[PDB]
Design a protein around this ligand. Structure first.
Ligand SMILES: Nc1ncnc2c1ncn2[C@@H]1O[C@H](CSCC[C@H](N)C(=O)O)[C@@H](O)[C@H]1O
Length: 216
């Protein structure tokens, strides 16, 4: 079971494990909406190559790894993380596609992409990936009320004053939605990226992209 997606004109292959009960063994639609958003906003602004020079990003709950891979393709250095059980598939997908795009574009310089274990809230895991990061990203990592606080605490622990948080999100329970929105509003300055910045094909009304700056 392997999904082939085009990102920045490159055909990538992401292995999946449907034999697994683990949520992260499947590619979720928010990661693809995030990757396609980057492809559309990488010519000018904060995701252009010159503006990403020297920037470091960390992906939380990367699963199969689509979102962090796209960001690394833009020239950002990226540490992609998940729990131990997901890491072998993540490591497989990173290394298989890294060798593909570099053989496809030998002269181009992509950002680095290294896999690390990070259980949300584990201070030892957080210290070990070497924060602070310029970007903290996550796609479809909000779904269960009990995971809101550990994710929040992790994002803050990896952040500094100038850190930007990018969140790909799919609305499910309205109760959880309202708790999540209030939480982000209590901790960040939140903006909701509009439909026009997302690709015409990779856009379902239920998928939202948030971009959040640290609070004053
Ligand atoms: N407490 C926790 N610590 C670290 N990762 C967690 C976690 N709880 C859930 N996750 C991870 O969050 C991911 C949710 S599925 C999202 C996968 C990927 N970002 C995508 O968009 O396709 C899973 O990989 C799961 O392992």
């Amino acid at each position: 079971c392997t999904v082939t997606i085009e990102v920045l004109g490159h055909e990538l292959d992401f292995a999946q494990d449907p034999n697994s009960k683990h949520l992260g063994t499947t590619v979720w639609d928010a990661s693809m909406v995030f990757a396609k958003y980057l492809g559309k906003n990488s010519r000018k602004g904060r995701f252009s190559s010159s503006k990403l020079k020297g920037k470091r990003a960390i992906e939380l709950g990367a699963g199969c790894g689509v979102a962090g891979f796209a960001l690394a393709m833009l020239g950002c250095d990226v540490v992609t993380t998940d729990q131990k059980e997901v890491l072998p598939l993540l490591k497989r997908n990173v290394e298989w596609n890294t060798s593909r795009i570099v053989q496809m574009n030998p002269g181009s310089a992509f950002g680095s992409l290294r896999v690390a274990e990070l259980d949300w809230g584990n201070e030892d895991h957080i210290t070990a990936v070497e924060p602070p990061f310029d970007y903290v990203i996550g796609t479809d990592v909000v779904y269960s009320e009990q995971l809101l606080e550990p994710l929040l605490r992790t994002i803050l622990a990896l952040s500094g004053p100038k850190t930007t948080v990018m969140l790909g999100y799919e609305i499910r329970s309205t109760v959880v939605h309202e708790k999540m929105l209030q939480m982000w509003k209590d901790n960040f300055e939140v903006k909701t990226i509009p439909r026009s910045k997302m690709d015409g094909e990779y856009q379902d009304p239920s998928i939202h992209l948030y971009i959040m700056a640290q609070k004053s």
